Amino acid sequence: STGSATTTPIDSLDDAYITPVQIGTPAQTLNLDFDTGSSDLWVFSSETTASEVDGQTIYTPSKSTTAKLLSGATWSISYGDGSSSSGDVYTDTVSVGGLTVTGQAVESAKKVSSSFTEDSTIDGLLGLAFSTLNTVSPTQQKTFFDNAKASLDSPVFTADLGYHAPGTYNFGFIDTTAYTGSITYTAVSTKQGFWEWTSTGYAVGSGTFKSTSIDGIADTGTTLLYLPATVVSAYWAQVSGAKSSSSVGGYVFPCSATLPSFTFGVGSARIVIPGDYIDFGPISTGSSSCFGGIQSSAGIGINIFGDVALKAAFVVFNGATTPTLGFASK
Numbered sequence: 001s002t003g004s005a006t007t008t009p010i011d012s013l014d015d016a017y018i019t020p021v022q023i024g025t026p027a028q029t030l031n032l033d034f035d036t037g038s039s040d041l042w043v044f045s046s047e048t049t050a051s052e053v054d055g056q057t058i059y060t061p062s063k064s065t066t067a068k069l070l071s072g073a074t075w076s077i078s079y080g081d082g083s084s085s086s087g088d089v090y091t092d093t094v095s096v097g098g099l100t101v102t103g104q105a106v107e108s109a110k111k112v113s114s115s116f117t118e119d120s121t122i123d124g125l126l127g128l129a130f131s132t133l134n135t136v137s138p139t140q141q142k143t144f145f146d147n148a149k150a151s152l153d154s155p156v157f158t159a160d161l162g163y164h165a166p167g168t169y170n171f172g173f174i175d176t177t178a179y180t181g182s183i184t185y186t187a188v189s190t191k192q193g194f195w196e197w198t199s200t201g202y203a204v205g206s207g208t209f210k211s212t213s214i215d216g217i218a219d220t221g222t223t224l225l226y227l228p229a230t231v232v233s234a235y236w237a238q239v240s241g242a243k244s245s246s247s248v249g250g251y252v253f254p255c256s257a258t259l260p261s262f263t264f265g266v267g268s269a270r271i272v273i274p275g276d277y278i279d280f281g282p283i284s285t286g287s288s289s290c291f292g293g294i295q296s297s298a299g300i301g302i303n304i305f306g307d308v309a310l311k312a313a314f315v316v317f318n319g320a321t322t323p324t325l326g327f328a329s330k
Contacts, residue, residue, distance in 0.1 A: 001099055001100075001148070001151045001152055001153065001172060002098070002099060002152065002153055002170070002171060002172035002173045003095075003096045003097035003098050003099025003148075003169075003170070003171040003172065004097040004098065004168060004169075004170045004171070005019050005020065005021075005096050005097030005168070005169050006019070006020075006166050006167070006168055007019040007034065007161065007162075007166065007167050007168060007169050008166045009162065009164065009165070009166070010119070010121040010122065011121070012164070013223075013280055013281055014161075014162075014163065014164060014223070014307060014311065015223050016033050016122065016221070016223065016307075017033065017034070017161060017167070017220070017307070018031040018032065018033060018121060018122060018123075019031065019032055019033075019034050019096070019097075019126070019169055020032075021094060021095070021096055021126060022094070022095040022096075023043070023059055023064070023092055023093070023094050023106060024059065024061070024063070024064030024065075024066060024067055024092045024093060025064055025065045025066040025092075025093060026064075027095070028057075028059055028060065028063070028064065029057075030043055030044070030057050030058075030059060030123035030124055031057065031121065031122065031123045032122070032123060032124050032125060032126040033122050033124070033125045033126070033221060034125075034126045034128055034159075034169055034220055034221070035125050035126065035127050035128060035129070035219070035220060035221030036128040036129055036159070036195055036217075036218055036219055036220040036221065036317065037080075037129055037194060037195075037217060037219035037220070037221045037222060037304075038077065038079065038125065038127040038129055038133060038221060039127040039128075039129045039130060039131055039132070039133035039134040039135075039143050039193065040075060040077050040107050040125065040127045040134055040135055040136070041094070041104065041105065041106060041107060041124070041125065041126045041127055041143065041144055042075065042077070042085055042087070042106075042107035042108070042109055042124050042125055043058070043059040043106060043107070043108060043109065043123060043124035044056040044057070044058045044059065044109055044112070044116075044123050044124055045058050045059045045060065045061070045087070045108040045109055046058055046059070046060040046061070046062065046108075047087060047088070047108050047109070047110050048087075048108075048109045048110060048111070048112060049110060049111055049112075052111060052112050052116075052117045053117065054117050054118065054120055055120030056120055056122070056123045057123045058123070059106065059108065059123075059124075061090045061092065061106075061108065064092055066092050066093045066102075067090045067091070067092045067106075068090060068091050068092070069088070069089075069090055070088075070089040070090060070091055070105065070136075070139075070141075072138070073088060073089040073105075073136050073137065073138070073139060073141075074086070074087070074088055074089070074136070074137055075087060075088075075089060075107045075135045075136045075137070076135055077135045079221075080222065080300065080304075081115065082113075082115075083113045083114075083115040083116060084112075084113045085109045085111060085112040085113065085116060086109065086110060086111050087107060087108045087109040087110035087111065088107075088108055088110065089105055089106070089107050089108065089136055089141070090105075090106045090108055091103050091104060091105055091106065092104060092106045094106065094144060096126075096144065096169070096171065097169065097170075097171065099148055099151075099152075099171050099172065101144055101147045101148050103147070104144060104147055105134075105136060105141035105142070107136065107141075109124070125221070126144055127143050127144075128143060128144070128145050128157065128220070128317070129143070129193055129194050129195065130143075130190050130193045130194070131143050131146045132190070132193045133193035133194075145157055145171070145317075145319060146319075148171060148172075149319060151172075152171060152172035153172045153173055154172055154173060154174070155172075155318070155319045155320050156171075156172065156173070156174060156316055156317060156318050156319060156320075157169060157170060157171045157172075157317050157319070158170045158174060158175070158178075158314065158315060158316050158317065159220055159310060159314075159315045159317065160175075160178050160179075160314050160315070160330070161220070161307055161310055161311035162311065163274075163276075163277055163311050163312075167311070174316060178314050178330065179313075179314035179328035179329065179330045180328065180329050180330055181328060181329055182328065183314070183316060183326040183327065183328040184266045184267045184268070184269035184326065184327055184328070185267075185316070185318070185324045185325065185326040186198070186266050186267055186324060186325050186326075186327070187324060188318075188323040188324050188325055190323060192217075192302075194217040194218075194219070194302075195217055195218040195219075195317060195323075195325055196215065196216070196217050197215075197216070197217075197218065197325050198213050198214065198215050198216075199213070199214040199215075199216065199264050199265050199266065199305075200212075200213065200265030200266065200267060200268070201213075201214070201264070201265040202214070202227075202231055202262065202263060202264050202265065203262070203263040203270075204234055204235050204238050204260055204261075204262060204263075205238055205260030205261055205262075205275075206260075207238075209263065209265070209270070210234075211265075214227065214228065214231070214264075214303055215302075215303060216297075216302065216303030216304055216305050217302060217303070217304055217305065218305050218310060218315060218317070218325055219304050219305065219306050219310075220306075220307060220310060221306075222304045222306030222307065223280075223293075223306055223307050223308070224280075224293050224294070224295050224304075224306050224307070224308050225262070225273070225278075225293060225294045225295070225304070225305060225306055225308040225309045226295050226296065226297035226300055226302075226303055226304040226306065227294065227295075227296070227297055227303050228296070228297060228298070228303065229296045229297075229298045232251065232294055232295060232296045235260070235262060235294050236251050236253070236292065236294070238260050239253045239254075239257050239259060239260070240254070240257065241253060241254040241257065242254075242257070242292070244296075245289075248283050248289070248291070250291065250292060250295045250296070251291075251292035251294070251295060251296075252283060252289045252290060252291055252292060253289075253290050253292055254288065254289070254290070255281075255282060255287070255288045255289065255290040256288070257290075258275065259275030259276065259278045259279055260275050261273060261274050261275050262275075262278065262294060264305075264309060266327040269327065271309070271312050271313045271327055271329060272312065272329070273308060273309060273312045274312070277293060277308055277311065277312060278292060278293035278294055278308065279292075279293065280292065280293050293308045294308065312329075313327045313328060313329065313330065314327070314328040314329075314330045315327055316328075
């Protein structure tokens with residue numbers, strides 16, 4: 001089997017991407033944030049505290065003939081940005097882009113933090129990291145990908161995120177028309193439950209490539225590119241007037257600037273992030289200070305190849321017995 005679904009930016013900054021997902025019978029379609037940095041599929045629901053729902057589409061398990069309470073199971077998750085959610089669990093039929101999993105754990109939110117309430121465009125998350133990170137207790141549950149894997153033509157999914165445009169998540173096949181050149185594969189460590197890999201270095205603009213190992217995660221659920229302070233300082237030093245602002249919470253730059261590109265290494269291959277991808281616009285409406293898309297990972301504890309980086313590539317998440325990651329230009 002295979003699946004193919006379009007993923008669409010939630011706003012003009014590509015802050016996140018939503019993908020329609022069919023849950024239950026008859027189908028209830030919710031727009032979920034596919035997150036390769038976590039491993040819970042959770043939704044706004046008829047159980048979510050009413051004051052914490054503001055415009056989201058909810059899953060109502062009582063209206064699904066295939067929903068079953070997973071008795072005694074609860075979940076609770078906290079994300080890197082400080083947001084959180086928690087609740088109980090149903091199993092139900094879940095389909096993405098024509099690919100159907102029966103018996104999928106659908107985590108129903110009883111509580112969500114303010115960041116989720118305030119984002120009316122995201123109806124929940126669909127985790128695509130390794131199932132060892134799943135938060136359901138006392139019986140840990142599998143991700144949609146883990147459940148689908150055995151049925152897939154090939155044990156892979158791909159992320160093809162757009163810059164200010166829709167893109168695609170495919171399951172079970174590699175679309176050889178969706179990228180240019182060849183795909184370069186690189187080793188993955190699953191020790192922390194993430195799609196963790198080591199970049200071979202970087203360049204700023206037209207500068208020389210610096211060969212250096214940068215361990216980090218491929219995380220579709222993180223907006224920006226978070227790298228070591230040394231790397232980030234070298235990038236912003238090439239932008240006149242750029243500075244790190246503790247009051248704003250990172251590097252800012254004059255909105256009048258033209259940003260240089262940023263290149264990262266994948267083995268001997270190179271992925272180029274155009275300068276425009278690194279512009280996240282005014283810090284507040286009407287400001288001439290703009291927020292940078294490359295930020296320091298210092299104090300996160302991990303480097304994160306978020307959407308800024310991933311959208312510059314066609315990315316293969318290979319979930320074979322020995323997992324790997326592939327990157328191609330596009």
